[PDB]
Symmetry: C3
Subunit: 247 residues, 3 copies
């Protein structure tokens, strides 16, 4: 028998670290991420990130999606009255006196991205009209469950070291498939392939105590490349550009 | 035996549809609705609608109830300092330098309406003072459960095709039975008359994933008739006018 | 045997009342309180109070912690563009064009206080950077559970009639132990020393229906003494001053 040298400890640790990071997403103590990216009429982006170690349920009213808004109030396009009149019309057919069909403050389109060990069967995304009645114009007809809004399979995955680790969905607020004047709701939970649910008797505490684990982050970027440079690549958030590059 | 004609298929389907809509409220995939309607000093209305397929728990601070506010910022009555001074006084007895006892921005009265297959025993509504201490002036004395706030039986139902389908409660913010300078909390869940709870081991997932199913809707209407015309009747939200008409 | 006088009924009732109030905190129908106190650059205080009969989970983004903000908008230090540029830099290293390293609107330091029959093992407090990635600069590396953030033992209790009834934690936003440009998350639940959990099959209803029992209260005080005079002592919220007096 012979021994005359060390194993490549440094290299072995590097492999372990690479796997540690690639596989961290499976830990219940890592995060799942949901980004709502709004492409505005000046080509600037408004980014809304939700995150949680376990579960994400979010909704955004029209005035939380337009720019400027009270979270990102860095432009001015309308006086108080003009904005009021506009909203009057977006809520109720012909009920407003606005001279504006659409607002300069309104998004042109969106990209929705979920990242982490997500339960794809839980990925749910619904753009309501301004009036915020689900799948209907009417309160009693309204329905909260529509297969169309379970968008998992319609999404396009983004790969990292050949692993699907994020999923992307995009659309236009041009009224053809999605409302022109949007209200947006979404949800996603982390995958659980085992029997013991994270909302069961013993795990529900942690879920509730961290239900508001992190505030939603709002960000405003000059244009998409700026966000790629200063956000997506920087923070390790997988992202798909207009020209369809996975960054 | 004889057969020589069709049954009235079209008519039978109409009955089925009428029942489908009248009875949709019993489906766990329909909505329950909670409206907080604020009648302002100019007779305009501020409407806040909460909705969820299962459960609604909401609270609103004073600055989310007055108008203007950061959600509906379409008037201006005060400078920054004036508003600060006012609030200073509303929070702490004689702790503010305002020259204003009451704000032009504050509501005169309210109407609270729950609609859907609601669990009336869950209907809870509490107007705290500005200082937001429940049923007390003191933190340790404060109590979260008071029978007075379980308002179900005090409400007046509104009927649709002879069925009680919404319930209304009203009051004045004149300090006599309700605080002049209000903070408002309410809750309501859908009725469950069967054994298997929607927060049990198997149903809790759906409850949590849709906890923020829909954003609260904020709306501002010229006066009550405008809202009747452009909102209540339009959206099939049952409503009771000042003159007590069920619309 | 002899009887010739009454017991001291009035006095006995007083003892019972004193105990009633001292012990109310153990009732599930009392409140637990969480105060985030921000000491600003002008020595004014911004107070954020969260409260709930059972459970508190909260997070605050940078723009909900600075002053002025959309909840307390009673000062003006920057134009829209200046503020945007500042935030650009706080989010992304060298990604902003601001001439300002720090904002006049940003807090110097904080005091976090939990009060009531709190589960000290549930007390969790985390100041993230502006970029809001937990315990990391990177999305996949991010971790939601760090012992450092379970601050219970690091806190200093405040006594009332010799009973520990509130706990205080303080720190500076000077970037040395806590980020200069903070995002803040915390949680705490009421103590449960018995077997039947308040999130179990029978108790989960009440927890959820009162999840948003009370809105967060925002308050702005001239300086610490003003808050002591008009808030802390007034409302029976235990508090520790700069000079370390328990009020
Ligand atoms: N199979 C083996 N058994 C014993 N020594 C071995 C063997 N293979 C290699 N060696 C090496 O041979 C060298 C001399 O070993 P040693 O003189 O103890 O052998 P041995 O006397 O034959 O073995 P043992 O101790 O089993 O009687 C040592 O450096 C040892 O590491
Ligand atoms: N009870 C009945 N039994 C059979 N046919 C009937 C009856 N009532 C009405 N009819 C009609 O009478 C017509 C002639 O029927 P058919 O000549 O097959 O009667 P049948 O020979 O008496 O009956 P079966 O086929 O039972 O021997 C058919 O159009 C049929 O629909
Ligand atoms: N141990 C006692 N038994 C009876 N009376 C008592 C006693 N101690 C004090 N007294 C008082 O003595 C007074 C007279 O009582 P009473 O004349 O009924 O006594 P008694 O006839 O000795 O007792 P009993 O009714 O048991 O035969 C009463 O005011 C009573 O309250």
């Amino acid at each position: 028998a012979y021994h005359g040298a060390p194993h490549e400890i440094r290299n072995r640790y590097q492999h372990d670290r690479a796997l540690e990071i690639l596989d961290r997403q499976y830990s219940r103590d890592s995060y799942i991420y949901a980004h709502l990216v709004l492409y505005m009429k000046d080509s600037s982006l408004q980014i809304i990130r939700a995150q949680n170690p376990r579960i994400i349920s979010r909704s955004y009213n029209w005035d939380q999606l337009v720019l400027p808004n009270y979270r990102i109030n860095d432009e001015k396009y309308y006086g108080r009255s003009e904005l009021r009149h506009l909203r009057d019309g977006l809520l109720s057919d012909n009920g407003g006196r606005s001279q504006h069909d659409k607002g300069m403050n309104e998004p042109v389109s969106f990209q929705f991205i979920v990242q982490g060990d997500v339960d794809l069967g839980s990925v749910w995304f619904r753009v309501n009209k301004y009036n915020n009645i689900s799948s209907s114009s009417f309160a009693m007809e309204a329905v909260s469950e529509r297969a169309e809004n379970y968008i998992g399979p319609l999404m396009r995955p983004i790969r990292y070291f050949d692993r699907e680790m994020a999923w992307s969905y995009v659309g236009k607020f041009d009224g053809i498939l999605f409302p022109c004047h949007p209200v947006i709701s979404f949800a996603v939970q982390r995958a659980n392939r085992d029997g013991a649910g994270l909302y069961n008797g013993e795990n529900i505490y942690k879920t509730l105590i961290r239900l508001n684990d992190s505030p939603d982050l709002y960000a405003h970027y000059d244009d998409e490349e700026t966000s790629v440079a200063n956000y997506w690549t920087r923070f390790q958030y997988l992202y798909r550009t207009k020209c369809d590059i996975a960054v």
